[PDB]
């Protein structure tokens, strides 16, 4: 199994990013994806989830109305577009996939984590 991060650098308050995460050997029954990110010394906090199931969303409040998360089925890679960025948002992504059955936690696998980079 691999979650291989893509898209990350530096960019102005105000512009426009897109992440990446192709995910290999996780099965598709319900599986759900997302992104995280860490700012230094601060603590991994959660950023928005797709459930692939479906394609239903979900955002932090931080990130609703700025961020859309998207998945491309048939290439298994999903996506984040972040666009009117702010410095806040500078941090480590990390990418994540899991699977939840009976409460049990099935599986869940991260990515190594992509820097992003907003300067003022």
Not at 24 to 53: D, H, L, N, Y
Not at 69 to 85: C, F, G, P, V, W
């Amino acid at each position: 199994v691999q979650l291989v991060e893509s898209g990350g650098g530096s960019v102005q308050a105000g512009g426009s990013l897109r992440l990446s995460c192709a995910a290999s050997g996780v099965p598709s029954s319900s599986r759900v994806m997302g992104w995280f990110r860490q700012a230094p010394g601060k603590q991994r906090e959660f950023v928005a989830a797709i459930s692939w199931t479906s394609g239903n969303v979900y955002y932090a409040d931080s990130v609703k109305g700025r961020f859309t998360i998207t998945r491309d089925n048939a290439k298994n890679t999903m996506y984040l577009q972040m666009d009117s960025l702010k410095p806040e948002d500078t941090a480590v992504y990390y990418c994540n996939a899991r699977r939840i059955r009976f409460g049990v936690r099935v599986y869940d696998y991260w990515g190594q984590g992509t820097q992003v980079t907003v300067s003022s």
